[PDB]
Design a protein around this nucleic acid. Structure first.
Ligand SMILES: [Zn+2]
Ligand SMILES: [Zn+2]
Ligand SMILES: [Zn+2]
Ligand SMILES: [Zn+2]
Ligand SMILES: [Zn+2]
Ligand SMILES: [Zn+2]
Length: 96
DNA sequence: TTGTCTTATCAGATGGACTC
DNA sequence: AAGAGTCCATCTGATAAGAC
């Protein structure tokens, strides 16, 4: 399971990375990027989903999932119901 | 195999809750 | 009581995986 190399936290609203590529929680990531030293120690309007790694907002200011949000940004039309994928997907993102 | 397309997952911006 | 400095969830934007 993904662990922050600084504090050891396994839960966080947004995983970030250091220069070498290793993982930091949101709090450790912002601190080290800001300061340059280690840190001391709801559903979608469109598709009605309740599971997403990143919530976004539509023009009116309502919450939409990552997929629905990024889709409208690229189509100027809401994400159709017939595109909704089952379960969760993950990707091996490389560093650099 | 090639390119297109969707959208995970990274990074930066913002703003409210906090401390000095 | 008013301001600047600090913290960090939550937002927007960039990059790019990986299925089609
Ligand atoms: Zn951490
Ligand atoms: Zn490292
Ligand atoms: Zn959605
Ligand atoms: Zn399309
Ligand atoms: Zn600010
Ligand atoms: Zn690829």
């Amino acid at each position: 399971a993904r662990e922050c190399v600084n504090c050891g936290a396994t839960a966080t609203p947004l995983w970030r990375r250091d220069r070498t590529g290793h993982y930091l929680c949101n709090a450790c990531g912002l601190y080290h990027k800001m300061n340059g030293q280690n840190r001391p120690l709801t559903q979608c309007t469109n598709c009605q989903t309740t599971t997403t790694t990143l919530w976004r907002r539509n023009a009116s200011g309502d919450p939409v999932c990552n997929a629905c949000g990024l889709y409208f940004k690229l189509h100027q039309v809401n994400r159709p119901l017939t595109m909704r994928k089952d379960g969760i997907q993950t990707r091996n993102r490389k560093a650099s």
